Scaffold this active site. Structure first.
Site, short mmCIF file in Angstrom:
data_model
loop_
_atom_site.label_atom_id
_atom_site.label_comp_id
_atom_site.label_asym_id
_atom_site.label_seq_id
_atom_site.Cartn_x
_atom_site.Cartn_y
_atom_site.Cartn_z
CD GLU A 185 -2.52 1.69 0.04
OE1 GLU A 185 -2.78 2.81 -0.37
OE2 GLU A 185 -3.28 0.62 -0.42
CG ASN A 208 -0.08 5.79 -1.26
OD1 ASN A 208 -0.96 6.44 -1.79
ND2 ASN A 208 -0.42 4.80 -0.68
CG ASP A 214 7.89 9.06 -3.52
OD1 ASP A 214 8.27 10.34 -3.52
OD2 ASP A 214 7.13 8.82 -2.90
CB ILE A 217 -2.58 12.56 2.83
CG1 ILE A 217 -2.75 13.69 1.84
CG2 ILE A 217 -2.45 11.22 2.11
CD1 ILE A 217 -4.19 13.54 0.97
CB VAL A 275 -8.89 12.05 6.57
CG1 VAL A 275 -10.57 12.14 6.21
CG2 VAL A 275 -8.86 13.12 7.77
N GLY A 284 -6.49 3.60 1.41
CA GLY A 284 -5.23 4.30 1.45
C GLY A 284 -4.21 4.11 2.35
CB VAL A 285 -1.00 5.88 2.94
CG1 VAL A 285 -1.30 7.40 3.12
CG2 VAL A 285 0.28 5.69 3.69
CB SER A 286 -5.35 7.19 6.43
OG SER A 286 -6.35 6.60 5.84
C1 LIG Z 1 5.35 7.16 -0.14
C2 LIG Z 1 4.45 8.20 -0.51
N1 LIG Z 1 4.42 9.23 -1.52
C3 LIG Z 1 3.16 9.80 -1.69
C4 LIG Z 1 3.11 10.87 -2.62
O1 LIG Z 1 4.22 11.31 -3.07
N2 LIG Z 1 2.07 11.46 -3.05
C5 LIG Z 1 1.68 12.58 -3.38
N3 LIG Z 1 0.61 13.21 -3.35
C6 LIG Z 1 0.82 14.42 -3.98
C7 LIG Z 1 -0.44 15.35 -4.00
O2 LIG Z 1 -1.84 14.65 -3.90
C8 LIG Z 1 -2.27 14.83 -2.73
C9 LIG Z 1 -2.97 16.17 -2.28
C10 LIG Z 1 -3.15 13.61 -2.63
C11 LIG Z 1 -2.54 12.12 -2.59
C12 LIG Z 1 -3.42 11.20 -2.15
C13 LIG Z 1 -4.98 11.42 -2.09
C14 LIG Z 1 -5.31 12.71 -2.18
C15 LIG Z 1 -4.55 13.90 -2.58
C16 LIG Z 1 -0.30 16.61 -4.53
C17 LIG Z 1 1.09 16.98 -5.19
C18 LIG Z 1 1.15 18.46 -5.51
O3 LIG Z 1 0.18 18.98 -5.68
O4 LIG Z 1 2.32 19.06 -5.79
C19 LIG Z 1 2.00 16.33 -4.89
C20 LIG Z 1 2.09 15.21 -4.35
S1 LIG Z 1 3.14 13.56 -3.66
C21 LIG Z 1 2.51 9.23 -0.57
CL1 LIG Z 1 0.76 9.75 -0.53
C22 LIG Z 1 2.98 8.19 -0.11
CL2 LIG Z 1 2.47 7.27 1.22
#
Ligand SMILES: Cc1[nH]c(C(=O)Nc2nc3c(O[C@@H](C)c4ccccc4)cc(C(=O)O)cc3s2)c(Cl)c1Cl
Length: 183
Positions: free
Chosen positions: A28, A32, A59, A80, A83, A85-87
């Site tokens: 999981e 992500n 990452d 994240i 609430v 998923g990783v939660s």
């Molecule tokens: C080990 C690991 N790495 C990550 C990871 O990198 N995820 C990233 N998510 C974003 C991003 O979406 C966010 C707001 C979001 C994520 C999930 C569900 C709803 C919303 C937006 C942005 C951005 O706008 O710059 C960047 C990232 S990086 C996760 Cl999660 C895990 Cl665990």
């Protein structure tokens, strides 16, 4: 709603006794990082099995945003991680440390059973970007907390095979075994 996960973990993660759910905790977190790769932001993922049977996934993606989220009044990262998923992984970890590298700052948050110990806090500088999750599976959820090289290797062989662009490093600190998988 982490309470719901803690109460009925089998329903969220898989069997908490036969190793299936324990390994899914890793699958999981890795999934992500794969999302971040597929979106074009992540080329490299690192998975470490620590000598104490904890896990680090790292990452080189954008890093989870840190900005306060209007509605909850806490960091987007906290939202994240807390609430539904990783939660789920968070909820079923006695300790989880999140480290985010984003806009030249290092941010960390520690949770216990998914509950934040403190708000996301600035701890350093960096010229890199990305997301690091270290978690310690809760022994109140899982019995026989022992990760398998073979199980994580197989999963990473799958992910590497299916995502030819991504480089995925598995390190076992218990044996010193490492392998970079990249198709
Ligand atoms: C080990 C690991 N790495 C990550 C990871 O990198 N995820 C990233 N998510 C974003 C991003 O979406 C966010 C707001 C979001 C994520 C999930 C569900 C709803 C919303 C937006 C942005 C951005 O706008 O710059 C960047 C990232 S990086 C996760 Cl999660 C895990 Cl665990």
């Amino acid at each position: 709603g982490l309470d719901a996960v803690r109460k009925r973990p089998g329903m969220y993660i898989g069997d908490t006794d036969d190793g299936t759910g324990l390994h899914h905790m890793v699958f999981e977190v890795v999934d992500n990082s794969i999302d971040e790769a597929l979106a074009g932001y992540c080329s490299e993922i690192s998975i470490t099995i620590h000598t104490d049977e904890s896990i680090t996934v790292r990452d080189n993606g954008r890093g989870i945003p840190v900005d306060i989220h209007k509605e909850e009044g806490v960091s987007a990262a906290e939202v994240i991680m807390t609430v539904l998923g990783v939660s789920v992984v968070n909820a079923l970890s006695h300790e989880l440390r999140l480290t985010i590298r984003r806009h030249n700052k290092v941010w960390e948050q520690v949770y216990h059973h998914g509950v934040p110990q403190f708000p996301l806090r600035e701890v350093g500088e960096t010229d890199g970007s990305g997301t690091e999750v270290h978690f310690k599976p809760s022994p109140e959820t899982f019995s026989n907390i022992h990760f398998s090289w073979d199980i994580l290797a197989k999963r990473i062989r799958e992910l590497s095979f299916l995502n030819s662009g991504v480089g995925i490093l598995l390190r076992d600190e218990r044996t010193g075994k490492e392998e970079l998988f990249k198709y």
